Design goal:
2 copies of one chain form a homodimer.
Chain A lengths: L1 H5 L6 H12 L10 H11 L11 E9 L15 H11 L3 H9 L2 E8 L9 E2 L17 H20 L2 E9 L4 H12 L3 H4 L11 H15 L6 H8 L2 H15 L4 E2 L3 H13 L7 E2 L9 H8 L15 H19 L12
Parallel strand pairs in A: 1-2, 1-4, 2-3, 4-5, 5-6
Bound molecules: nicotinate mononucleotide (2 copies) and 4,5-dimethyl-1,2-phenylenediamine (2 copies).
One 4,5-dimethyl-1,2-phenylenediamine sits at the interface of chains A and B.
């Protein structure tokens, strides 16, 4: 794991320089394509893409798991929905499945801790039947966190061998916006009230209880904000740990990762805390309607491309933004050049 | 033309109701897909789509024309770039061509007033070799404006016959952000300084001159803000008139139109002023980096889906958002239902 974090490659400034020069000479006013140009350059710096903005196979990894904190009354959805929905993921009827299909990406459903019997067709990496109730103690041990990080990381970079060049991350777990809020609060230094949202339609009246639970989880566990793994194991979850692992794996693989919503933001904060070298590989997708989204994105210093007021999770936003990443590549490779048209601009 | 505006159909509330009910029963927390759900319902109300959110063939109409106000030193790009770029549009090497190809849409290049010899492969609807310099008088006569509106409208709704269900609008004309700013100023009531931007990389030092020109154009022409056609003919342009015509044509055809950038916003203001019934058919794409974008979007009461800091024009943003429109349809048609999975939510 120390080896893993140690070998994360730095962006290729040489490739980025050639990219910028090429973009500037395209049939358009310099910089007129805004963030599309910026995105194209970023990709070019990623060693896994071979010095150029390109997109081969696409995959969305969905980490599924249950949370003990569900018993604290912080989620209105039945607990079994996690297992049921994970199963639907294999049938391609879920939101991320439909959106991924539109983007030509493949959805990988991974069980890292669902509290139910194993689901056929689902990748099995189950740590336990649900994580501990963070309200009264840790969600898991530090070893269980590190082990899962390692496992998911290898799985991710292994997919690279099969031709995957763009990753999307997502989750599925009833009550997971609670540990996510706790993590955001700890990494950010913001009060729980500022980060706790309604998750999956939590009634406004029950919001006060959710804030109390987050506070309790933090007071009891005393997670070290300077230790990302410590925070994840104490007030996080298996699904959140998995998302972090995907980010570390892609970074080590020198490939781009598309974040999704609020849950992915907390995992991204943890990842960047564990290994800053990961940041250059992160690509935002949309701006989650969850209350604590603005704060989480600010500390990540990211500005999403899409404002859809989405809050489904599953990696649905990640899939929706994949066409954008491909558009930056198309621009870079298919556009004509000013010089070829004898156009000279000041 | 009065017949045209008179026959614009109202949205189908019955179809929209069935749509909302169907979306609410999808395999996800009600409303969790945010603006995707809202978009899906909007499409369902459009009579041309036959009571359901669907997308058949896609087209982007690019209105090209030159402006006399160019001689006032408000644009840094050579005037011939309009003709040269219009030609490149036929070769598929321009920004909108590359982005449209990615979206599977066809680009229609239409010449409504380029100041150069006719370009082969370009649809000819030329009103004149460039419009009048709005700084010293009107850009065109009221009749020339009404005639072009009618011509473009018919062309647009005629494409519907060929299977087009989604339209994208765009333009090409050196110096056109000047008349666009003038129009936004008049329709909005905002001062020129608040709406004039740098267009295609206009040096910050030359911005003062551009503001003066806009003021002069308004003072001399005295356009009636309550008369959209009056405003277009006086301080608008052929390309701006064409964009307005596309919007009126699609609306009459009961079909959706994707706006592009700042130039499209001014055309949209004019269109909604001429016929309010057009508003329900307008779909925003991205948020233009042009200074007067926020104000124009506010009066249009629209919130773009994409924040790419783009300012190329051509309809490049419109093309970039087409996948989003298709995603709303995919969600609506391909997602599973809660009842089928025995999932019950409060
Ligand atoms: O991705 C987001 O921004 C997102 C925001 C709110 C809710 N969710 C989804 O809803 C679940 C978490 O909501 P909750 O109320 O059970 O804490 C989880 O399974 C996520 O997939 C996801
Ligand atoms: O669409 C926009 O928001 C947009 C914003 C700024 C500039 N443009 C493009 O640049 C041209 C107008 O810029 P300018 O400086 O000649 O007034 C015109 O041909 C447009 O296609 C387009
Ligand atoms: C200079 C220039 C300006 C614009 N507006 C466009 N579309 C293209 C080029 C090349
Ligand atoms: C209830 C519920 C919640 C979530 N978070 C998801 N993805 C799906 C469903 C059905």
């Amino acid at each position: 794991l120390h080896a893993l974090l140690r070998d994360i490659p730095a962006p290729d400034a040489e490739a980025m320089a050639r990219t910028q020069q090429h973009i500037d000479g395209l049939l358009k006013p310099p910089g007129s394509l805004g963030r599309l140009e910026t995105l194209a350059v970023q990709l070019a710096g990623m060693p896994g893409l071979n010095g150029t903005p390109q997109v081969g196979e696409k995959a969305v990894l969905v980490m599924c798991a249950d949370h003990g904190v569900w018993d604290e009354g912080v989620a209105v959805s039945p607990k079994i929905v996690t297992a049921i929905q994970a199963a639907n993921m294999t049938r391609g009827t879920t939101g991320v499945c439909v959106l991924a299909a539109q983007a030509g990406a493949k959805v990988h459903v991974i069980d890292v801790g669902i509290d139910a019997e194993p689901i056929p067709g689902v990748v099995n990496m189950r740590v336990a039947r649900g994580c501990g109730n963070i309200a009264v103690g840790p969600a898991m041990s530090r070893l269980q966190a590190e082990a899962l990080l390692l496992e998911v990381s290898r799985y991710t970079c292994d997919l690279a061998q099969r031709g995957v060049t763009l990753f999307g991350v997502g989750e599925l777990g009833m009550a997971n916006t609670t540990p996510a809020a706790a993590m955001v609060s700890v990494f950010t230094g913001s009060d729980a009230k500022e980060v706790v949202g309604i998750g999956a339609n939590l009634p406004p009246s029950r919001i006060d209880n959710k804030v109390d639970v987050v506070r309790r989880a933090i007071a009891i566990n005393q997670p070290n904000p300077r230790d990302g793994i410590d925070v994840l194991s104490k007030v996080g979850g298996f699904d959140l740990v998995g998302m972090t692992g995907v980010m570390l794996g892609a970074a080590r693989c020198g490939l781009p990762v598309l974040l999704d919503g609020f849950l992915s933001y907390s995992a991204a904060l943890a990842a960047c805390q564990i290994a800053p070298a990961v940041r250059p590989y992160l690509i935002p997708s949309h701006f989650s309607a969850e209350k604590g989204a603005r704060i989480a994105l600010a500390h990540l210093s990211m500005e999403p491309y899409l404002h859809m007021a989405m809050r489904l999770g599953e990696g649905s936003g990640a899939a929706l933004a994949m066409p954008i990443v491909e558009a930056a590549c198309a621009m870079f490779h298919n556009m004509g050049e000013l010089a070829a048209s004898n156009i000279v601009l000041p």
